[PDB]
């Protein structure tokens, strides 16, 4: 609202900082820390990436614990078959999730 | 009313399963308000020692619930210790903004060639300010002060209410980096000071720490209209939702100081501070000042503020809506 | 620095006075002073205006008469307005809304006394019922425009006035002077009298048209309707027959029976229905 | 001192009386001449107007720094009718209120040598109104030294109150032209 209200005062153009919502999935252990987990997405690495920054083609991708995940590239997001960490909240929900741990 | 009743029934049912789906229960409570129930459930989680899910629920609560709801939950919990403190930190922003800040800092795949081309194309103050805003928009939490460190002369070219915009861009790029406030604005005129206060508010957007008190003191001690405008913007931005009587009083005094530059910011900041509150006193005061004053800038600010003061309150607004429309 | 959001609010009385002076002195660039107050740094009310003598030829501004100005101001203060001079207005009958060299010199003279003085240019000839051609101006500094500065500050997006006209651009806009946006004050009380204009008394509302004249008018109009019916029969016949030129070049210079017949039916039906209703209402009320 | 004054002149039928040489009309003309000359010699920003008290209770010339206009207008005057003087003073006070110079001290000087048949209650009421609205009056009486002098003294005292010195009265018995007394009166003496 305040950003759109910039005609009468340009300095109000910065209010989009509020609207900017990081689109990401972050895995946290029981220690409120970031384990080096690897999420798996069954999406081609051209349907979801930054284009032209300044095997023919796989249907496979992997991301680190801090992961850039968009609403479109979140439903197909998953994790490997077996891992030390299992996402308590389904990945399809998105957001910052917690990872239940195995024995060690 | 019927939606609330259905939510009550759904919450009660969810609290009857072999695997109680507390994430959906907490979503229902968020949509229902009533923070006491979620606070009691949260203490029950602490007692049961279910830290994983008891922490996922807190992440969800911070993500969705409003600041007032979060504060109510916090005070309810006030009325073991390490778990309580970690949970309170998570609920009241602590580490919740830091996680996103660190994530965005490391994931900052920006492309500065686009902005090099843009600034090559810039020829006037409008485009200069637009490029400043674009740089701020591309950085956001990512604190890469790349251009604003490399090109001091290009930044220094624009003046007047362009120092304000550049400092607000500093606030945007430093957003989330709440730890180094004051210490970090020590890097950087009335326009500069107002922009710095607005940048502090922007960095602490929707996070009412001691920066609210700092902004209150600086706005009380403010001497120029530009600095008062910047301080009001920053204070309201920091205290959005957190309806505080002292903040309201200072902002109202600044508004009643009938200067257009400070008046617009004062109206917008009153609206921000009292967002969703719907107190007849402030609604009446703002409408009366809008109808009394003779400064179109102050009218614009008060219009935005009156719009914001009722963010929620969907149906119980028709009286004010009709009055304003007529 | 000045902002690209300044707004000159010309009151209804001010606008009417400028337009009257305009279509009273033509082609002379008649001139007057605009009285108001700089309420803030972004707004200029022009509460009133008053003309100047316009001595002799007035194709150019006439070096405002200080004694006349002073006596105007003193008497206005005596009988009301305690307001200072916020600018000067003058007429450009058909030229447009630009400023000449003499206008620029006079506006320098006004700024020297008051840096905020505005220069309003009205166009009484080009004004029409619903859009009055008028523009506010202040002069750009040669010093800054040579020393690389924009003599306006773009805090707002209010610099979209009308995509300034080519006439103004070639006559010196955006180089030696800039246009200030103009708005108007609506009170809903003066508007009541402005609406009372065009109003007809109940005498006229209830009067019946002379019955003999009404009958003669109906007879005549029906006669033209008869002739247009003949011509309409002719035209509809040779309309679908060929349409190479029927689109646009088959009615230019020639009467359109359908159009004129529609006009005649409209006018006569209006007249007859209105007179019938008037007669009936009269027969009852005046019983 | 900035002074906005008006001279109320009674021009009743009695002002063909010859007790003042040559006639009360010429004596009044000389009196207004000298008082207006004193006003001019005072702060030139001071301005003077003229009111005639008769059956019409009219205002001849409003506030104006110039004096020739007032002199010509008063010369173009004849004595007719009776005096009201209540209208007179009220209209004078309205002229005071509607003066271009608000900073000018309000002043009415009334030549009222005549029988004033107005009830003392309304006289005192008007005096109280004038004093509470802060207009001082310097009344001048001649001819009838007994018929109305008591009423005028009471009126001036009512204006005075306890310390309202601005209100004054000057009564002159018959004799030569009404010049020596007006010159050697407290009113022009304080100028």
UniProtKB/Swiss-Prot annotation, chain A:
Family: Belongs to the proteasome subunit S1 family.
Protein name: 26S proteasome non-ATPase regulatory subunit 1
Assembly and interaction partners: Component of the 19S proteasome regulatory particle complex. The 26S proteasome consists of a 20S core particle (CP) and two 19S regulatory subunits (RP). The regulatory particle is made of a lid composed of 9 subunits, a base containing 6 ATPases and few additional components including PSMD1. Interacts with ADRM1. Interacts with ZFAND1.
Residue numbers of the full-length protein present here: 764 to 919 of 953
Function description: Component of the 26S proteasome, a multiprotein complex involved in the ATP-dependent degradation of ubiquitinated proteins. This complex plays a key role in the maintenance of protein homeostasis by removing misfolded or damaged proteins, which could impair cellular functions, and by removing proteins whose functions are no longer required. Therefore, the proteasome participates in numerous cellular processes, including cell cycle progression, apoptosis, or DNA damage repair.
Signal peptide coordinates: none
UniProtKB/Swiss-Prot annotation, chain C:
Residues annotated to bind Zn(2+): 90, 92, 103
Pfam families from the UniProt entry: JAB, RPN11_C
Positions bearing Phosphothreonine: 243
Biological process, per Gene Ontology: double-strand break repair via homologous recombination; double-strand break repair via nonhomologous end joining; proteasome-mediated ubiquitin-dependent protein catabolic process; protein deubiquitination; protein K63-linked deubiquitination; regulation of proteasomal protein catabolic process; response to ethanol; ubiquitin-dependent protein catabolic process
EC number: 3.4.19.-
The protein's enzyme class: hydrolase
Domain MPN: 8-143
A GO MF label: metallopeptidase activity
Keywords: DNA damage, DNA repair, Hydrolase, Metal-binding, Metalloprotease, Phosphoprotein, Protease, Proteasome, Ubl conjugation pathway, Zinc
One CC-aspect GO term: cytosol
Family according to the record: Belongs to the peptidase M67A family. PSMD14 subfamily.
Function text: Component of the 26S proteasome, a multiprotein complex involved in the ATP-dependent degradation of ubiquitinated proteins. This complex plays a key role in the maintenance of protein homeostasis by removing misfolded or damaged proteins, which could impair cellular functions, and by removing proteins whose functions are no longer required. Therefore, the proteasome participates in numerous cellular processes, including cell cycle progression, apoptosis, or DNA damage repair.
Subunit (UniProt): Component of the 19S proteasome regulatory particle complex. The 26S proteasome consists of a 20S core particle (CP) and two 19S regulatory subunits (RP). The regulatory particle is made of a lid composed of 9 subunits including PSMD4, a base containing 6 ATPases and few additional components. Within the complex, PSMD4 interacts with subunit PSMD7 through their respective MPN domain. Interacts with TXNL1.
PANTHER family listed in its UniProt record: EUKARYOTIC TRANSLATION INITIATION FACTOR 3 -RELATED (PTHR10410)
Official protein name in the record: 26S proteasome non-ATPase regulatory subunit 14
Biological source species: Homo sapiens
Gene name of the record: PSMD14
UniProtKB/Swiss-Prot annotation, chain D:
Keyword annotations of the record: Isopeptide bond, Phosphoprotein, Proteasome, Repeat, Ubl conjugation
Keyword Repeat in annotation: yes
Biological process, per Gene Ontology: proteasome-mediated ubiquitin-dependent protein catabolic process
Every VWFA domain range: 4-187
Sites of the Glycyl lysine isopeptide (Lys-Gly) (interchain with G-Cter in SUMO2) crosslink: 121
Assigned GO CC terms: cytosol; nucleoplasm; nucleus; proteasome accessory complex; proteasome complex; proteasome regulatory particle, base subcomplex
A GO molecular function held by the record: identical protein binding
Subunit text: Component of the 19S proteasome regulatory particle complex. The 26S proteasome consists of a 20S core particle (CP) and two 19S regulatory subunits (RP). The regulatory particle is made of a lid composed of 9 subunits, a base containing 6 ATPases and few additional components including PSMD4. Interacts with NUB1. Interacts with SQSTM1. Interacts with UBQLN4. Interacts with UBE3A. Interacts with UBQLN1 (via ubiquitin-like domain). Interacts with DDI2.
Domain notes: The 2 UIM motifs are involved in the binding to a multi-ubiquitin chain in a cooperative way.
Family: Belongs to the proteasome subunit S5A family.
Role noted for this protein: Component of the 26S proteasome, a multiprotein complex involved in the ATP-dependent degradation of ubiquitinated proteins. This complex plays a key role in the maintenance of protein homeostasis by removing misfolded or damaged proteins, which could impair cellular functions, and by removing proteins whose functions are no longer required. Therefore, the proteasome participates in numerous cellular processes, including cell cycle progression, apoptosis, or DNA damage repair.
The protein's name: 26S proteasome non-ATPase regulatory subunit 4
Species assigned in the record: Homo sapiens
Part of the whole protein covered: 2 to 192 of 377
